[PDB]
RNA sequence: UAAACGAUGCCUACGCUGUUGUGGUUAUGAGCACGGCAGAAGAGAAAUCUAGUAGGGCUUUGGGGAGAGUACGCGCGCAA
């Protein structure tokens, strides 16, 4: 669940010369399995050829609007140089729900209508 | 525009099946009811759930919305039927019809108090 | 490709028809291909009957009518917008139109 | 015209995968007499009536469950009987059944009667 | 870890209570339309082969975006076949949807003999036709110990029916892996279903098992509400 | 065994992949009318029923029964 | 000849003033063996009775044959004829449905609360052509009610009868629901209670029952 | 010589329904010759269907693009 440790997981295996596609593919188990509801990564730079291309991936639910996203959304960017140029990374992660407050909010997200069953 | 949104809808057509007795013509008993028995977490909500209910109530009491059974009016429909049709076609027994029928009468004997159409 | 199964035309059991000329531009175009548009006009304006009521010198009076056919090729009847492109499904609906005034 | 016995085999052909049990066809010759009734023997058609028109001449016959398909072939090829294994593996789908009808100096006859009677003819027709 | 089935369909109700046979179920023309009713009688038996993997692509404003296509039969080496193909973004995914396809279009296939019926069938019974697309494939009968005379592909297909000699001919574009495994896959189950001179005195009738057995499921009706 | 069913109106074997086949039953009158435990049952094939043709052949087989 | 329970007086009047018998102008190669003759004034093709009472004799047998009777599934998508299923499928033990059918509701498992059909009733069936197609994925017959205009591919049993008019639809499923519980021995005649129940079916509309209503209570 | 085109050779077959024409004839129910239209089933790479089924008979005709329907010879034409 924090997004400044799989980042440093990512810039890692970069310089261990490790394609980005099994990178990325890892980082996403890593935080899906730990129990993050959703995550967004991107990578951008050289990182094929001579022509620069940024490769985004989304999985699961990620929030970008409104007071929603400050409490259960999580950033961090990081930088790996190599021997053409930099390499940008980076990482956002959704929080799980979570009652006594540890993982993420206690209260759910303030839209969702939940209706209680009858006796 | 001052259109009420899918979420709102929906509470408002779930609580009207799943409590109908309990409501009223009056938006501040409705008002209560949803006070009561809901998650809702902003009065904003609720003020516009109770609207749409106390609006659909008037409808579904002057002889019911299509697409919104109530059980107290599926009641009320059977007492309606039950207060049954006096009219007969029962009572008819003497009649007149075209010769094509009259033959049909004969080919299979038919008996009774027919006559051909005098038209 | 083949895009109509009558070929744009309304020839069928013959060899040859008659041509006609446009009424926009004079080009040439077969009978049973022509566009075709019919006309009844008044030859007194709407905004001038309620003063013949008082210029006319009979007790009654009706106003003569003024009658055409035209006829249009294919690019005048597009350009004029008495017909338009339309999708592959609508192409084989077939309805006649109003007469012009 | 066509050909009398090739007209035969398509209208029972097409009557079959139509679904219909009873056909009428409607130019009939000495052959095709002769082929109906082989038809019958090995229980491919059950019922014949001819009728006597003064007009050529017209057959109606009822078809059983067991027919798949029937054809003539055209021309009718001159074989020794070394050669009739050959069509035999041509036209029919398997060794096991079936029928390939060869004209003879003893009437219509089967490919398996020609080694019987150690007689080869001429090829004519064919059914499964 | 692993998840029970509860059957979501009537015939699942059947095979979980242990009512029927899967010759039962061939034999009455019933619909399979729950993957798990194969496994249950052929989960320790199946086999699979990836017939072919292909990448696709759809032109955007933005550019390609693109799938994998995977193409593959299940089959037992005894009697059972099945083929399907799925799409996915991945060739895992892909995998997962076409075994789905393949289970729910199984099929029984019959086998015949050359010539005298000594021993065990071992050929398709009559010769046949199949056609998919621009392909057409044609089977025959062999004599016993000539083996698999077939082309690359279809060669496989014939192996997890459990044939065990055919002559094969082909025709049109068999570079296009789909329609040559569809086509011949048409070409046995055609000679399988060929009007024997037998078949109408091998004839026998049944009442259906689901109207059969409408007492227990009845009784599993009640018991499923109490 | 999984080869052993026969359509009745058109005399040929169904396929086990065919979803348009259908199994008809019927019950049996009774004395005075009324019904009884024994069934009628027919095996249909799907290509009679996209013609659209079982209609008239079901009520030519009651009557030839 | 076919076994079929005897026709009684009553009920041959009966279905006669419901005009049940007043066909269509048009007429279908599936139908000409109901039709007996053509109204010289109208052009309307009337329907032969003693046919009539045969194919409801046989519907009613193969509804029989079925244990379970939640798995007979009615469906009628219409006002007009509305009613007469709701309390149809009661008489007999069935399921019903009412308003639109959903597509891919006999097909999908998600879509709830349809069971899987063993037999399928339709009335009008030129509305409903959804439900005769989706049958066809799960091997159940169809019975359908239906008129000389209108021909169906799937429907195994046609029973001939005017679908076009309130009083017409009331008779045929009143009558139908009768045999079903008479050939079960649930009654002992045919003509016990007819008024009663060919009434109750028959479609009011809202002005009607107002009108009724206030009569009812004058009398009460 | 023509996009001389429905870009679909000529005889002869077997083949589902509804509707609308033209000319004769009619037990007034219908037919025969020549058409138009709308579905179906099959077919086909599809679009669609003069294209369904098939070892019926006879003639013309194509064999990856180009060079080329061009060179040489020959036959017709006043020339083109
Ligand atoms: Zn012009």
């Given at each position: ?119 | ?119 | ?101 | ?128 | 870890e692993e998840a029970e089935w509860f059957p979501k369909t009537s015939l699942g109700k059947l095979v979980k209570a242990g009512r029927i046979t899967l010759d039962e179920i061939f034999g009455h023309s019933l619909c399979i339309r729950e993957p798990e009713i194969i496994d249950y009688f052929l989960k320790a038996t199946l086999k699979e082969e990836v017939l ?18 995977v193409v593959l039969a299940l089959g037992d080496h005894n009697n059972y076949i099945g083929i399907g193909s799925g799409?996915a973004?991945?060739?895992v995914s892909a995998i997962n949807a076409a075994k789905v396809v393949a289970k729910c279009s199984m099929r029984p296939i019959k086998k015949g ?6 021993g065990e069938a071992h050929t398709v019974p009559?010769?046949?036709?199949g ?8 089977v ?8 698999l005379?077939?082309?690359?592909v279809s060669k496989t297909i014939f192996k997890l029916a459990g044939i065990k000699?055919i ?11 789909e329609?040559?495994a569809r086509?011949s896959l048409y070409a046995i189950t055609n000679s399988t279903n060929f009007?024997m001179?037998?078949v109408?005195?091998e004839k026998v009738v049944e009442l259906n098992p689901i109207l059969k057995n409408a007492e227990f499921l009845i009784e599993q009706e009640?018991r499923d509400?109490? | 065994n999984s080869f052993q069913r026969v359509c009745?109106?058109?005399?040929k074997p169904i396929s086990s992949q065919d979803r348009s086949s259908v199994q008809?039953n ?15 049952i027919?095996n249909v094939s799907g ?19 | ?66 244990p379970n009777?939640?798995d ?34 006999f097909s999908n498992y998600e879509?709830?609360?349809?069971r899987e059909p063993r ?17 066809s994925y799960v091997n159940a ?80």
């Amino acid at each position: 669940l924090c997004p400044a440790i799989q980042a440093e997981f990512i810039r890692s295996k970069f310089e261990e010369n490790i394609p980005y596609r099994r990178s990325v593919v890892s980082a996403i188990k890593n935080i899906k399995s730990a129990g993050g509801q959703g995550c967004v990564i991107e990578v951008s730079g050289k990182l094929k050829g001579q022509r620069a291309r940024s490769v985004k991936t989304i999985d699961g639910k990620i929030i970008h609007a409104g007071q929603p996203k400050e409490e259960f959304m999580r950033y961090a960017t990081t930088s790996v140089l190599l021997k053409q140029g930099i390499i940008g990374i980076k990482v956002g992660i959704m929080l799980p729900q979570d009652d006594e407050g540890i993982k993420g909010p206690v209260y759910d997200m303030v839209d969702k209508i939940k209706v209680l069953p009858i006796k | 525009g001052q259109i009420k949104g899918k979420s709102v809808r929906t509470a408002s057509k779930v609580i009207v099946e799943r409590y109908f007795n309990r409501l009223t013509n009056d938006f501040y008993d409705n008002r209560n009811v949803v006070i009561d028995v809901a998650e809702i977490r902003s009065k904003k909500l609720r003020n516009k759930v109770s609207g749409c209910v106390t609006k659909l109530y008037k409808r579904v009491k002057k002889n019911g919305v299509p697409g919104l059974y109530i059980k107290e009016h599926e009641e009320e429909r059977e007492k309606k039927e039950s207060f049954i049709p006096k009219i007969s076609i029962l009572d008819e027994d003497k009649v007149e019809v075209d010769e094509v029928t009259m033959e049909m009468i004969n080919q299979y004997e038919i008996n009774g108090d027919y006559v051909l159409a005098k038209k | 490709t083949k895009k109509r199964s009558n070929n744009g035309r309304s020839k069928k059991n013959r060899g040859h028809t008659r041509c006609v000329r446009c009424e926009h531009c004079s080009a040439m175009v077969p009978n049973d291909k022509a566009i075709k548009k019919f006309v009844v006009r008044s030859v007194i304006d709407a905004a001038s009957l309620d003063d013949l009521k008082i210029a006319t010198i009979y007790e009654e009076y009706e106003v003569p009518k003024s009658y055409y056919k035209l006829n249009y090729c294919v690019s005048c009847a597009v350009h004029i917008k008495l017909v338009r492109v339309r999708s592959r499904w609508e192409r084989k609906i077939r309805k006649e139109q109003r007469v012009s005034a | 015209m066509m050909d009398k016995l090739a007209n035969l085999c398509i209208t029972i052909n097409n009557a079959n995968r139509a679904q219909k049990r009873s056909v009428v066809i409607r130019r009939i010759s000495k052959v095709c007499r002769l082929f109906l009734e082989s038809m019958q023997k090995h229980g491919y058609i059950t019922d014949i009536v001819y009728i006597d028109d003064h007009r050529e001449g017209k057959a109606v016959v009822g078809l059983s469950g067991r027919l798949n398909r029937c054809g003539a072939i055209c021309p009718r090829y001159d074989v020794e009987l070394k050669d009739v294994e050959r069509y035999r593996a041509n036209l029919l789908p398997s060794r096991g059944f079936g029928h390939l009808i060869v004209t003879s100096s003893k009437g219509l006859i089967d490919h398996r009667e020609c080694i019987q009677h150690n007689t080869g003819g001429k090829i004519l027709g064919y059914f499964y | 870890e692993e998840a029970e089935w509860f059957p979501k369909t009537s015939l699942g109700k059947l095979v979980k209570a242990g009512r029927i046979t899967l010759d039962e179920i061939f034999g009455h023309s019933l619909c399979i339309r729950e993957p798990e009713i194969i496994d249950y009688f052929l989960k320790a038996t199946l086999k699979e082969e990836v017939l072919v993997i292909k990448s696709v692509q759809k032109q955007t404003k933005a550019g390609q975006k693109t799938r994998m296509k995977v193409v593959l039969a299940l089959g037992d080496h005894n009697n059972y076949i099945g083929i399907g193909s799925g799409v996915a973004r991945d060739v895992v995914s892909a995998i997962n949807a076409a075994k789905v396809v393949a289970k729910c279009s199984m099929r029984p296939i019959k086998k015949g003999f050359w010539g005298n019926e000594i021993g065990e069938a071992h050929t398709v019974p009559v010769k046949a036709l199949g056609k998919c697309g621009s392909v057409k494939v044609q089977v025959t009968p062999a004599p016993k110990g000539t083996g698999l005379v077939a082309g690359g592909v279809s060669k496989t297909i014939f192996k997890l029916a459990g044939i065990k000699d055919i002559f094969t001919s082909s025709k049109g574009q068999t570079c296009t892996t789909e329609n040559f495994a569809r086509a011949s896959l048409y070409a046995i189950t055609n000679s399988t279903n060929f009007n024997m001179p037998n078949v109408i005195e091998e004839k026998v009738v049944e009442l259906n098992p689901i109207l059969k057995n409408a007492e227990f499921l009845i009784e599993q009706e009640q018991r499923d509400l109490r | 065994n999984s080869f052993q069913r026969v359509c009745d109106f058109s005399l040929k074997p169904i396929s086990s992949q065919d979803r348009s086949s259908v199994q008809i039953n019927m019950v049996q009158l009774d004395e005075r009318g009324r019904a009884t435990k024994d069934l009628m049952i027919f095996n249909v094939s799907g290509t009679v029923r996209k013609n659209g043709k079982i209609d008239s052949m079901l009520y030519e087989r009651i009557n030839e029964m | 000849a076919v076994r079929v329970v005897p026709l009684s007086d009553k009920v041959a009047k009966a279905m006669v003033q419901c005009c049940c018998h007043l066909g269509g102008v048009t007429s279908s190669t599936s139908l000409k063996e109901y039709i007996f003759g053509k109204r010289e004034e109208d052009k309307v093709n009337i329907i032969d009775i003693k046919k009539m009472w045969e194919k409801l004799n046989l519907a009613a047998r193969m509804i029989c044959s079925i244990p379970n009777p939640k798995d007979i599934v009615v469906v009628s998508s219409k006002d007009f004829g509305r009613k007469a299923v709701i309390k149809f499928a009661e008489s007999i033990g069935a399921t019903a449905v009412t308003g639109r059918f959903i597509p891919g509701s006999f097909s999908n498992y998600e879509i709830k609360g349809v069971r899987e059909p063993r037999l399928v009733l339709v009335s009008d069936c030129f509305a409903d052509k959804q439900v005769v197609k989706e049958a066809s994925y799960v091997n159940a017959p169809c019975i359908a009610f239906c008129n000389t205009d209108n021909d169906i591919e799937f429907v195994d049993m046609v029973i001939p009868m005017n679908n076009r008019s309130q009083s017409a639809i009331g008779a045929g499923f009143c009558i139908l629901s009768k045999l079903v519980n008479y050939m079960k021995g649930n009654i002992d005649k045919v003509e016990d209670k007819l008024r009663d129940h060919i009434e109750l079916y028959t479609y009011r509309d809202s002005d009607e029952l107002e009108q009724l209503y206030q009569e009812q209570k004058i009398e009460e």
